[PDB]
Design a protein around this nucleic acid. Structure first.
Ligand SMILES: COc1c(NC(=O)c2ccc(NC(=O)c3ccc(NC(=O)[C@H](CC#N)NC(=O)c4ccc(NC(=O)/C(C)=C/c5ccc(O)cc5)cc4)cc3)c(OC)c2O)ccc(C(=O)O)c1O
Ligand SMILES: [Mg+2]
Ligand SMILES: [Mg+2]
Lengths: 402, 517, 517, 402
DNA sequence: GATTTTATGCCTGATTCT
DNA sequence: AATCACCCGCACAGATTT
DNA sequence: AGAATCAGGCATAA
DNA sequence: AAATCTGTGCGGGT
């Protein structure tokens, strides 16, 4: 039954793995420690015990083999968690959406059919890597995209990077790195809310000064700010766009209704701005960052790069050039699945007892878990659809602005 | 070891999977009515140069190219997707021209990859028209090495004519086919009047039109489906009874069957039903279809009436089927339920955007070419000083600098250079330092290089005149493109002409009949 | 329903199959030692640009290209043929460089086509050297649509170096490998003296040289095989008996094994033999072969004697094998049995023919280029009248007729032509009417067209002098080519230089040791 | 398994097909008259019963299935040809060398184990096509390569092609057809003697006048003749070879020969046009074609293809232009195997009773057949090798060439 | 992604007959 | 060379229980 | 005691 | 004798 049993007969120091796919199973068998480790490949997606009747569960081959491997019974008057084998159980699925679906199916089976095993804490989840980085000598593995981004930013400022503005400033580490990190955070904040506004307007508002609501007036003051913004936007284009504006008053404040048009005979007819937008904290942090981010570069400016010097304005291109310099002699690989990894990599990345990383599964509350399992894995479409709609991107549009 | 609650893990994993499947696998895009796999397959076939009037290619070539380059999934799914688009009994207008064994209406089978060949169809070139003129946006592939279009610049109303069917988490979609000429007439009627009502649209679009040419039994569900996006219709086969006189024999002939029905299963189910005595009055059953038409023969006993047994068959077996119309599609990366008018409006907006972007690209190209032609024409009128300057210089770089240093008088070509509409034919990125100044022409570096690349053969009269003719033609083209960009009424005329041409080329006759109960 | 006798059908069918298998599948060619599948694989890999200093490609791509274009057979045969050429323990000098899992000496098997990658090896470029200079013939493919070489213009003695093995209908062939340096020395010795005997050749070629580096036992079989063409030799493994005093118990250590032997089957066979009390004095068996090298350990009993137990293993186990040398190859499209001198003579004749054809091609090219260069120089000598004539041209054709139909003055270049006289550089096809006749050049049509296709950029001094330099060096090249074609000694000197260069680049050391009985 | 049986039960109206390959069998099962036709796919090559033992014959699976399907007995004292199902048997193998090998193996089995079946005439051979050609409206299948040449020639001379000599004569078909057929036959004869003489010499001899050996004797005009021939050969030489001539007067009729030094640096000693060559009929028919193929074309000439025109000055140019013009709107398909055909093509070309074509196998003499079978299919190598060498290229030099 | 047993010639050792 | 046993939503016979 | 017979292994093909 | 319950298939994914 594709089971590669272990050598240790004591049911307190053995392990069991539920590998996804056949190539990954073969590689795990190749690279395992045969003394106290077992393997059980899964060929495809398994039955959903939440929907299936009890009669059909016993007929299925996959769950039958799993029950035989575990050694405990199934059903009332036959289940006996005392007579247990393989006190450690690890999932170790792929790092894509299908892997997560398989993980949910396995967790549903373990919770519904054998609650005591999950309660006592014998279920673990592995965490293989995604990216591999090589630089000749220094090579390593990186999990998730966020860690890769952090590594890239750190390598961008791994020594050197002394930004000389006018005569001889020296940020010298902390100032430059902290400014870059805060800039990346603000860029992420802009990107998460990018749907509701254009990128050009948000990217130009940081360079513009504060709104100065104190001196605002119906005439001679409302027009100046909006006209300055529109003039600054118009003269930086490459797609044949156009920015125009109009303003109005409603006896409380002087509100703006800017308009833009590009590659379309239609028109939005409004990008309204009033007290609500200025009162928001997003604009406050944008202005706070823009106070530091101004035209500090004089007629002469450069960066004391390693045996390099690129004196230009438009610091974004300088950042891209620095990234290119960091990536000049760097090698990056993105794994596709567990099959690609060789047995040595699998042994040294997940199956090593003294360098691996895992997660332990625990149960906090019973009624909440039962309700969630019934809602998501049940055979009633409407609660599931409502739950998906509630937690959609609208719930992701959190207006904390921080 | 770090703890984690089960509820958070379950919620995160299941939401990730569901949201990826909703906008990643199943539902189609409203603008062109294609799922991602179809778009990637068609784009890959386009890049290989697998046109509609060239030699065939093996299926394994295309499948391997798609899997290696764009689509990181299994190969059985890709091959099944390719096979389904080449069957005359699945799509109203096939998008692939296949050679080999691609299955039959009995649902038999399809041969493996190594025993079949494929190429693009003629209509499939209309979906990807003007793809090279920067009319749509490109996005990264699964590892940031290639580029894939975001949406095809379609010219046919693909979603309505071909239909769709898909299953996702929490929802599904099912849209039937239609006839091309009727849909084009509906689009033209919408363009002529935006405030048209559903009743007005239904004058041009009576209903669906399936490939298999069955009979639609009813007219009340179509109105509800087109007015709200959900409905139900009944599809009925075509059959009759003929009497040969003599001994008063009766026989039933079946010609046409409903949509998505296997003939072999129908025949064996009828055999099982008559064997179990659940249907009375049937003597024998035969199939006699051979290369020309469909025929199923049923013999009835001499002590029975054909109408009763035929109605019992309609009520019991699969000779009549139900079809539940349910329209769901992606609008801006979000699922949504739609009706006929929304689909038509989305198609029209897509066409407007595509035409505008194409016009801008063409205008830029024409302006650049006219800029080069001006320099060549001015250079051809000062031959003797130019050759003297080139001969005296020892190196091409010195000659280039000498050419660029001094201005050159226009000479006898001053009539046409100043005849343009001031700055109509002037590139946008050219500084005011260069160009036609007060009676003198100033050359840039690239104009100097173009002058140095000139041959002796151009010194003849005919070659000299062809350049001037080309310049005048370019001026006329620039004027036309500017006029198109100017007003909002020329664009609709262009769109109308394109739609009429498509109707004239790819039109055809109706198959399915619509009747009351 | 025409009849047919069984005898005629049997005779025709079996004769057709037998002849096709004999001259199309199993036997190699004496001139380059390749079967048709090997030649087609190498040619297909060459055409794709899959060189040795570029990125790898997937095996499925190359296999599909070979199957579609040249070889009309299945995928498994082609892929296994590709796999065998990339194994270091099969070929003495590998011809394909692979990345993936291509088996192991222990007995494993390679992965699938979808999981491996390949490219050409550095030495394989020497077999296909000077392929574009019309050095060999070309023949049609199966469907009469492509062209494939008839034989490669090889520069390595592939047949002796890599050996061969094949089973035809009615006959078979089996040839072992050899060492490259010894073979090159033998070829040079043959070039020095053409009446050398077999004893004279065996001074430089002691015997075979396998990749696995076993021992060869006896010497009579090698002499018999080289003299007649059929022989038998014995291959023995390398093993020793070791003891560290102390307890006085010795052990047998095996480092190497014969050619084409599986290690796992050997170990299990020894286990089965010692199980049934068939071999006495063996206590334990273990395999310590990993990474560093091969080591098989046999621990004998306390009372055992190492030599006594060791001598039985050669007689009983597979630590000693017999190799039967039998040389058969195609000479002029028919099988024949060869000996060493025939193979060496055939290789030398092939080299002579290839070099002669290459020289003829190069001479033709040089003369063709010099013909145009002379016209360009003469045209530049008289630029002002030429442009004055061209400017009054209604069309280019009239300008060409005006240029052709008159003599031209040589000017200041005629002195250079004093070196170019004596009919050394005139093309063969050219008539005496044209060219320099009485100090007045006469132009042809193609020279006039080349003049009309002249850019202004070539009116500078540097571009004017480069033409004269090119002409001056082309004359010396023509002289050297004519001198090579004029005698026989120079051809042999060139061949000796090429062989010495190959020996310097790709030479290596010996592995197998030959011993007396 | 692996047997699609028919519904007919009377063993006098049934049929059986033995198809090569699995995909071809699958295609054939769909497109067949299911009433009275059966299929039995063969996966690969089968056993050679001449070289095998009875026990291994009964052990194999393919031959066991065939024996079970046929319905008769096996071996002596059990075999009974009266209890025969499927009175008609058809082979239908592929059209390559391996197909013929499989055909020989099947015939060996049937003749060795069931002589009565073969003698009574219950075995047939099927002949599927190779090429398919379409021209917009016309469509047809073509067998082998000779029929393709005939079809190409017929299409080339399909209407128009009124050859004009000087101003406007009209060969108009049949005379031109006879000339074309004669030219093709002579070219086919010429191609099969490249080993003994160069191709260029044989091609050139047709245009020069007849030698007229009757009046030759010793007029010393042979020197001028060979000089003219060598000058003509050296005129249009384009590969660097050179030619010379030599003569002598060993007998009353003078003899001469050319010498050629060729690309390979070797010189062939001579190609003497001696008594055997001049008196032979091959040279006589070469001169016969040459007499009608002298300078018939005048200063002005052209080939009148349908609604087209082109001036030419040679017959080969006219033929090549006609062939290239005839292939404008033509489409061709070539079948690499039986698995490339969809079921309808197989039905209408091989399985339809009213449009198929087959051959019937019969026995002429018994002792000769037994001797041939023993010689070819026996397990003694040397007689087979001698037989193959006898009918090798040494006996292929047929002096008839007609 | 993993899925049978044959033809063809020369040589070995193991087993069966007289 | 086509086939393995499940996941996802909707509509519909034929079969058991109230 | 010694001939005669029977299997299995090597590289390109169904 | 009305009301639940159990199966089957359509098209892209392990
Ligand atoms: C010779 O062929 C040809 C060609 N050919 C080519 O040029 C050619 C080129 C490339 C290729 N291929 C590739 O590049 C290629 C192929 C495959 C891959 N995949 C992967 O790496 C990854 C693995 C990793 N990491 N895979 C997957 O993610 C994967 C996904 C799903 C599954 N599915 C499951 O597990 C199932 C179904 C379970 C289940 C569960 C339960 C159950 O009861 C049943 C099932 C399995 C694997 C990657 C690349 C090729 O192959 C197509 C070609 O043919 C050209 C011309 C001719 C000619 O004649 O002209 C010709 O003949
Ligand atoms: Mg995956
Ligand atoms: Mg074949």
């Amino acid at each position: 039954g594709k089971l590669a049993d272990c050598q240790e007969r004591d049911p307190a120091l053995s392990e069991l793995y539920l590998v996804e796919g056949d190539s990954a199973g073969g590689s795990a068998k190749q690279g395992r420690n045969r003394k106290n480790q077992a393997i059980l490949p899964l060929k495809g997606k398994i039955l959903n015990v939440e929907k299936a009747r009890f009669d059909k569960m016993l007929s299925s081959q996959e769950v039958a083999t799993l029950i035989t491997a575990l050694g405990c019974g199934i059903g009332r008057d036959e289940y006996n968690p005392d007579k247990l084998r393989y006190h450690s159980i690890i999932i170790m699925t792929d790092a894509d959406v299908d892997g997560s679906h398989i993980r949910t199916l396995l967790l549903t089976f373990f919770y519904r059919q054998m609650p005591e095993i999950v309660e006592r804490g014998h279920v673990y989840i592995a965490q293989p890597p995604l990216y591999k980085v090589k630089k000749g000598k220094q090579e390593q593995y990186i999990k998730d995209d966020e860690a890769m981004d952090q590594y890239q930013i750190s390598i961008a400022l791994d020594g050197a990077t002394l930004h000389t503005n006018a005569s001889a400033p020296a940020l010298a580490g902390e100032a430059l790195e902290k400014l870059v990190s805060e800039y990346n955070a603000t860029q992420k904040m802009i990107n998460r809310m990018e749907r509701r506004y254009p990128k050009a307007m948000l990217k130009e508002l940081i360079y513009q000064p504060t709104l100065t609501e104190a001196d605002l007036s119906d005439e001679q003051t409302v027009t100046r700010w909006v006209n300055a913004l529109v003039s600054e936007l118009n003269d930086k284009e490459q797609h044949g766009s156009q920015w125009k504006f109009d303003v109005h008053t409603n006896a409380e404040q002087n509100l703006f209704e800017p308009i833009v048009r590009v590659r379309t005979h239609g028109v939005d007819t409004d990008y309204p701005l009033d007290h609500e937008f200025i009162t928001g904290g997003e604009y406050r942090r944008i202005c706070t960052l823009g106070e530091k981010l101004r035209g500090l570069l004089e007629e002469d400016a450069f960066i004391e790069r390693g045996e390099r010097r690129q004196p230009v304005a438009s610091f974004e291109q300088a950042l891209d050039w620095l990234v290119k310099e960091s990536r000049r002699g760097l090698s990056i690989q993105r794994y596709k699945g567990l099959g690609e990894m060789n047995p040595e990599q699998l042994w040294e990345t997940t199956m090593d007892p003294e360098s691996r990383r895992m997660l332990r599964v625990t149960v906090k509350d019973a009624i909440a878990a039962d309700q969630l399992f019934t809602t998501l894995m049940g055979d009633a479409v409407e609660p599931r659809r409502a739950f998906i709609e509630e937690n959609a991107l609208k719930a992701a549009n959190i207006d904390i602005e921080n | 070891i770090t703890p984690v609650n089960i509820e958070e893990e379950l919620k995160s994993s299941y939401l990730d999977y569901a949201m990826s499947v909703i906008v990643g696998r199943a539902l189609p895009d409203v603008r062109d009515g294609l799922k991602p796999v179809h778009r990637r397959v068609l784009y890959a076939m386009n890049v290989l140069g697998n046109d509609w009037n060239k030699a065939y290619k093996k299926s394994a070539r295309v499948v391997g190219d798609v899997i290696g380059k764009y689509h990181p999934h299994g190969d059985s799914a890709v091959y099944d997707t390719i096979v389904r688009m080449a069957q005359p009994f699945s799509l109203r207008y096939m998008l692939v021209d296949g050679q080999g064994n691609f299955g039959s209406i009995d649902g038999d089978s399809a041969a493996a990859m190594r025993y079949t060949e494929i190429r693009l169809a003629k209509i499939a070139h209309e979906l990807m028209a003007d793809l090279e003129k920067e009319t749509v946006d490109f996005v990264d592939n699964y590892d940031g090495t290639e580029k894939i279009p975001d949406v095809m610049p379609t010219k046919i109303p693909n979603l309505l004519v071909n239909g769709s069917s898909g299953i996702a988490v929490g929802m599904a979609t099912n849209i039937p086919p239609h006839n091309l000429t009727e849909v084009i007439n509906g689009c033209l009627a919408y363009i002529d009047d935006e405030d048209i009502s559903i009743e007005g649209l239904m004058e041009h679009i009576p209903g669906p039109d399936f490939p298999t040419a069955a009979i639609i039994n009813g007219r009340r569900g179509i109105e509800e489906a087109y007015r709200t996006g959900r409905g139900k219709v009944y599809i009925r086969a075509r059959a009759e009874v003929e009497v040969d006189a003599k001994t008063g024999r009766e026989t039933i002939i079946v010609h046409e069957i409903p949509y998505q029905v296997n003939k072999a299963r129908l025949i064996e189910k009828i055999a099982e039903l008559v064997k179990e005595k659940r249907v009375e009055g049937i003597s024998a059953l035969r199939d006699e279809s051979d290369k020309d038409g469909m025929r199923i023969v049923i013999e009835v006993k001499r002590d029975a009436v054909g109408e009763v047994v035929l109605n019992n068959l309609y009520s019991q077996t699969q000779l009549q089927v139900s079809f539940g119309i349910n329209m769901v599609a992606l609008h801006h990366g979000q699922p949504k339920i739609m009706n006929l008018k929304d689909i038509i409006a989305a198609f029209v907006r897509h066409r407007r955007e595509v035409v505008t972007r194409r016009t801008i690209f063409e205008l830029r190209k024409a302006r650049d070419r006219a800029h080069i032609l001006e320099a060549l024409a001015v250079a051809l009128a000062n031959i003797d000083p130019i050759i003297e300057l080139i001969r005296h210089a020892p190196t091409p770089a010195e000659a280039k600098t000498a050419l660029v240093a001094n201005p050159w008088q226009l000479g006898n070509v001053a009539a046409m250079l100043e005849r343009a509409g001031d700055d109509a034919a002037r590139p946008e990125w050219l500084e005011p330092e260069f160009g036609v100044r007060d009676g003198l022409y100033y050359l840039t570096e690239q104009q100097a290089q173009a002058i140095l690349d000139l041959r002796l053969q151009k010194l003849t009269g005919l070659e000299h005149e062809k350049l001037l003719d080309e310049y005048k033609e370019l001026l006329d083209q620039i004027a036309e493109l500017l006029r198109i960009l100017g007003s909002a009424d020329r664009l609709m005329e262009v769109i109308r002409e394109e739609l009429e041409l498509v109707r004239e080329q790819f039109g055809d006759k109706r198959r399915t009949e619509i009747t009351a109960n």
